A paper describes a structure:
Here, we present the X-ray and SAXS structures of the human RyR2 N-terminal fragment encompassing amino acids 1–606 (hRyR21–606) obtained at physiological chloride levels. The structure of hRyR21–606 determined at 2.39 Å consists of three domains: A (residues 10–223) and B (224–408) adopting a β-trefoil fold, and C (409–544) formed by a bundle of five α-helices. The first α-helix of domain C (referred to as the central helix) is positioned in the centre of the structure and forms contacts with all three domains. Most of the interactions between domains A/C and B/C involve the central helix, strongly suggesting a significant role of this helix in maintaining the integrity of the N-terminal fragment. Residues 1–9, 79–106, 379–386 and 545–606 are not visible in the hRyR21–606 structure. No Cl− anion was found in hRyR21–606 and the structure did not show any evidence of a chloride-binding site as had been observed in the mouse RyR21–547 structure. Significantly, despite the presence of chloride anions in our crystallization solution, there was no electron density in the close proximity of Arg420 in the hRyR21–606 structure to be assigned to a Cl− anion. In hRyR21–606 this site is comprised predominantly of Arg417, Arg276 and Tyr125 side chains that form a net of interdomain interactions that do not match those described for mRyR21–547, but resemble those observed in oRyR1. Thus, the N atoms of Arg417 are within hydrogen-bonding distances of carboxyl O atoms of the domain A aspartate, glutamate and serine (Asp61 OD2, Glu40 OE2 and Ser63 OG). The Arg420 NH1 atom forms a hydrogen bond to the main-chain O atom of Val300 and Arg298 NH1 of domain B. Moreover, the guanidine group of Arg420 makes a face-to-face stacking interaction with that of Arg298.
Ryanodine receptors (RyRs) are large homotetrameric calcium-permeant ion channels in the membrane of the endoplasmic/sarcoplasmic reticulum (ER/SR). Cardiac RyR2 channels open in response to the action potential during systole and mediate excitation–contraction coupling by effecting massive release of calcium ions from the SR lumen into the cytosol of cardiac myocytes. The N-terminal region of hRyR2 (amino acids 1–606) is the target of >30 arrhythmogenic mutations and contains a binding site for phosphoprotein phosphatase 1. Genetic diseases leading to cardiac arrhythmia [catecholaminergic polymorphic ventricular tachycardia (CPVT1) and arrhythmogenic right ventricular dysplasia (ARVD2)] are caused by RyR2 mutations that increase the diastolic calcium leak.
Residue numbers in the entry: 10 to 25, 26A, 27 to 78, 107 to 378, 387 to 544
Write the structure that this text describes.
């Protein structure tokens, strides 16, 4: 009945907070690119608004004892020191040296970091109550205290006079660990929750997607099937997300409901009332409207609450080999196509076509990561452009969201991400990195990233000096004006280099 935690498992860390007088269960979150600091992701509201668990997922990489200064899936014990590697970025949860918190000032920031050298990235696990003691096994759903090895502070939910962040402070916070996947349950070519994938009519040679990264950002909401090069572009990528936190990263089965998120725009596949398909904002992505399922055929689910299996005895879904039928849970309708006598329209219907058979195709790590970096960049840069827009339209600088600091940080990360291989590498090694590089470039180009960079350049160029920008946007904005522009140019050069 009870579940322990072992090294190599994926987990999330949750706490409860009072927001507008009410309790919410939140995950410890962090983005790789563009800001290394931890923040929080609500999970309690999942039936109305789907949480993004990708930024919340950590692997317990090590679990060491007292005399120390992975192993074979050692079990977590109270009093052990742990290392948490962020799944999405390759980085680790660290107690940093900086203090961006006026509230406490004896608190240290907590964020992501790759330098794993000191003690800053180690945390010791401690009992919340008398019901657990040093040496005992940490159970799933145990309330935990985490203590930084370098700084002796608690992993702490801070009510910063604004609102909610995480830090390391001498006040404690109760965290509970939820399991996401097992480090010993292998992938083996099967569909796992959290996967980024493409959905194909294999025989028709096409994939489910949306209109190209061009005009009609509102137009980009519609859904259709398309053959050709789109099958190796970002816009045909979808992230499958289960409806629960626990085990959201294990094997998916026939009948098991899920949302499907369009990676590039971050919107969720949904059925409207007039019964047409449309991508919805996270804020409107309710279960009834966004929940779908795979079915081994179009027969009947009426066998009770008994596990569904294919024509072989296997309950899981295989990449490549399995034929799948997407069903909207709430209406029971099928995801089909319709001919408009390069592409054809995706629709929901009770009959369908005899060849609705979707084949699944796992995306590569490389293209998946890239697709996600694009979504972050577009989101951040759209805020930046909008903020710049309000300012030119005379809005009071204090009321405007202008993410100067994130923009500098993202551009640095982005430039690094497009850095060509240094000469001193072996020839075959350089060739490989040059290939990854071209792919990153192609995916960025197809998503219209060049025009977006040019758009940010143009908006900054309205101003004639740093001091002119300072006058409208404030001193700190003024002092990054030229460095942001330089970075924008550098990034733009990186996008086209070697074409």
């Amino acid at each position: 009945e009870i579940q322990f935690l072992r090294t190599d498992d994926e987990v999330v860390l949750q706490c409860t907070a009072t927001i507008h007088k009410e309790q919410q269960k939140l995950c410890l979150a962090a983005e790789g690119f563009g800001n290394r600091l931890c923040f929080l992701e609500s999970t309690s509201n999942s039936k109305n608004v789907p949480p993004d668990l990708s930024i919340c997922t950590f692997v317990l990489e090590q679990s060491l004892s007292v005399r120390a200064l992975g192993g074979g899936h050692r079990t977590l014990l109270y009093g052990h020191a742990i290392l948490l590697r962020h799944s999405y970025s390759g980085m680790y949860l660290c107690c940093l040296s900086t203090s961006r918190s006026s509230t406490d000032k004896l608190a240290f920031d907590v964020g992501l970091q790759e330098d794993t050298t000191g003690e800053a990235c180690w945390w010791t696990i401690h009992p919340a109550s008398k019901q657990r003691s040093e040496g005992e096994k940490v159970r799933v759903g145990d309330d935990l205290i985490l203590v930084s090895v370098s700084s002796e502070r608690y992993l702490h939910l801070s009510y910063g006079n604004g609102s909610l962040h995480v830090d390391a402070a001498f006040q404690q916070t109760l965290w509970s660990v939820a399991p996401i996947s097992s480090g010993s349950e292998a992938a083996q070519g099967y569909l796992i929750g959290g996967d980024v994938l493409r959905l194909l009519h294999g025989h028709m040679d096409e994939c489910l997607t949306v209109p190209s990264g061009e005009h009609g950002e509102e137009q980009r909401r519609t859904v259709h099937y398309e053959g050709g090069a789109v099958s190796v572009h970002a816009r045909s990528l979808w992230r499958l997300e289960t409806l629960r936190v626990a085990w959201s990263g294990s094997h998916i089965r026939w009948g098991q409901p899920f949302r499907l998120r369009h990676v590039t725009t971050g919107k969720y596949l949904s059925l409207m009332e007039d019964k047409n398909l449309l991508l919805m904002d996270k804020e409107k992505a309710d279960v009834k409207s966004t929940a779908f399922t795979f079915r081994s055929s179009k027969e009947k689910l009426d066998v009770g609450v008994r596990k569904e299996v294919d024509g072989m005895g296997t309950s899981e879904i295989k990449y490549g080999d399995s034929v799948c039928y997407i069903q909207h849970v709430d209406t029971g309708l099928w995801l089909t196509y319709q001919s408009v006598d390069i592409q054809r329209k995706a629709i929901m219907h009770h009959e369908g076509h005899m060849d609705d058979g979707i084949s699944l195709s796992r995306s590569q790590h490389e293209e998946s990561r890239t697709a996600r970096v694009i979504r972050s960049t577009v989101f951040l840069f759209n805020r930046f452009i909008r903020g710049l827009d309000a300012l030119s339209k005379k809005a009071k600088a204090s009321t405007v969201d202008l993410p100067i600091e994130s923009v500098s940080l993202s551009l640095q990360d982005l430039i690094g991400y497009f850095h060509p291989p240094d000469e001193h590498l072996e020839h075959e090694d350089k060739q490989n990195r040059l290939r990854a590089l071209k792919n990153r470039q192609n995916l960025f180009q197809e998503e219209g990233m060049i025009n977006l960079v040019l758009e940010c350049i143009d908006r900054l160029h309205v101003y004639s000096s740093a001091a002119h920008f300072a006058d409208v946007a404030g001193r700190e904005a003024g002092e990054s004006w030229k460095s942001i522009l330089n970075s924008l140019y550098e990034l733009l050069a990186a996008l086209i280099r070697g074409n």
